[PDB]
């Protein structure tokens, strides 16, 4: 009946209108507390934030999921004020991202598994607030270490029926190993989001990761540098492929008959600590519009190119409750 | 007069015997915070670092320097409970280790000066505790970020006076590539002490930098996995050198001249979470004393050489209240 939030549990009916793929503040961890300033202020932050959701809100959007991890700086008080000033829900994320700490590179498949429930389970250091999704990452082939990681995210899925998200390469076909390593785990596809997916063209990727049951994670459609040429960070960061490019993507997959399979974002944030300095301004001037981009640029555009509004509610309603409901557990 | 503690600021004869490399809780940032259970608990890691401080004070320890950076995992909360109840001062640092997270790999010299900065002049987090020491480090030859910090640390100590200390390793005679980068932003070498110099027999390596007029840090002197051959985490980061070898280059810098130079500690800890699982218990079964070793068993075995008292007290009450002073 129920997803956790960071204010506690909602019914499968209140998520509504949901990002699947979304940050308040990627950072890392410790990193806000020890170096507010960084961001001008937790305060500044926290405002930066509330206006951001509130734009989102009003757009239609009524859930985001926070994706940070542990290791991305994920601060789970940050989003409960958050969640709480504009009224969307935050459903928050345990798992490893890319910058994992020696404390964690050091551990075991059974530690991780641990790990993982503990944030499920008990709750997010000593806040109560309960993880709804596990996020992983790799960016090509799979260390020894990332293969830890998505053996123990399976397991603790299995144990709890939490979905599974994560980062690719996906010019790199990252999906078909992460998929290979997760059902060598019995892992349901149907359970598992391979993100990052608009990054790359490949049809044939994703159409057969699709088939297969996968949800496909059509996560950054406004990540573009076009304009931003002559920025090395902004263009390695963004890419030079334009968001009509990447949405385009999207009805793609509903053409060729895998609308239960994509789930939609665009993977903002408000804060961004771990790239270079200035690149929270320089995405900000690319996309004002943040996390209503998808609401409010993508919909129409997809709308005027024939895609009904029933499937596009579809893919942004139906589609995320479907995903985030948890499952039961094994045994 | 004043040096900045977990507990405020105190006077420099309120340090008396000093540990200038020691660490309550090695780990990562957040790390204790969202993963309490790795150390069985909190209250579990509060109790048992009490009573190891507790033991070492009743030895005759009287501070202790927790060199643990944020990303050593730092947490500054968690220093100040334990000197509370153990009575024992605990001077906190700033700078970074060998494990910085993306959010301070892609920061400039400017930015991380400005960070070493707010945690000596403003506090650490929300806490109001400043530092009292800044610590860098090394693992042979300096990546570029690492000269990064080194630089910031430098600019950082300038600014206010608290030294630097270091990691490194001793046997590629890392103190000197520090030593070269610290004074070309113009520190004084009586601001840095090279620490882990106790992890090579090199006596003509660490001679030529105490002659250059650096602080010589024998933090390491338990650390020996003599006895656990068959361990091979253990050995690889404890060494198969004994204590009583690093113990003697203690006196071998005494006999040279270099007594005022010599900074002294244990370097252990009570919780360790960045290595394998089992590292702490296994540090705990050849090293029961822990942070209580120096007094406990270094003190003894210099004075049976003959070290007068005064030496040694001159080395763990005079050097450090020197270093730690800020100047
Ligand atoms: C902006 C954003 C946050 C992190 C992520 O999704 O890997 C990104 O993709 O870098
Ligand atoms: C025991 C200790 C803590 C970290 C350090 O001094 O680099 C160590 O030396 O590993
Ligand atoms: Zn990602
Ligand atoms: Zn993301
Ligand atoms: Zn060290
Ligand atoms: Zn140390």
Not at 56 to 61: H, K, L, N
Not at 261 to 277: A, K
Not at 280 to 288: A, H, K, L, W
């Amino acid at each position: 009946d129920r997803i956790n939030t960071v204010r506690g549990p909602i019914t499968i009916s209140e998520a509504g209108f949901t990002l699947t793929h979304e940050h308040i503040c990627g950072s890392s961890a410790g990193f806000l507390r020890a170096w507010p300033e960084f961001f001008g202020s937790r305060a500044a932050l926290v405002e930066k934030a509330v206006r951001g959701l509130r734009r989102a809100r009003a757009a239609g959007v009524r859930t985001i999921v926070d994706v940070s991890t542990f290791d991305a700086g994920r601060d789970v008080s940050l989003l409960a004020e958050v969640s709480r000033a504009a009224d969307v829900h935050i459903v928050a994320a345990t798992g490893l991202w890319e910058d994992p700490p020696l404390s964690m590179r050091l551990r075991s498949v059974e530690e991780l598994t641990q790990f993982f429930l503990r944030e499920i389970q008990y709750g997010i250091e000593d806040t109560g607030i309960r993880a709804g999704i596990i996020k992983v990452a790799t960016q090509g082939k799979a260390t020894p270490f990332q293969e830890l990681v998505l053996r123990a995210a399976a397991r603790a899925s299995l144990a709890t029926g939490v979905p599974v998200t994560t980062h690719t390469f996906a010019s790199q076909r990252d999906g078909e190993q992460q998929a290979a390593i997760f059902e060598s785990e019995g892992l349901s596809p149907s359970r598992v989001c391979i993100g990052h997916s608009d990054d790359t063209d490949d049809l044939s990727y994703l159409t057969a990761l699709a088939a297969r049951g996968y949800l496909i994670g059509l996560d950054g459609i406004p990540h573009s540098a076009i304009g931003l040429e002559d920025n090395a960070s902004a263009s390695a960061l963004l890419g030079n492929r334009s968001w009509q490019t990447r949405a385009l993507l999207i009805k793609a997959l509903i053409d060729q008959g895998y609308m239960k399979q994509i789930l939609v974002s665009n993977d903002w944030l408000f804060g961004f600590s771990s790239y270079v300095t200035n690149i929270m301004d320089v995405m900000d001037s690319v996309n004002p519009d943040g996390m209503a981009f998808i609401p409010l640029r993508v919909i129409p555009f997809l709308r005027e190119k024939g895609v009904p509004q029933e499937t596009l509610a579809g893919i942004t309603v139906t589609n995320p409750a479907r995903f985030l409901s948890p499952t039961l557990r094994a045994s």
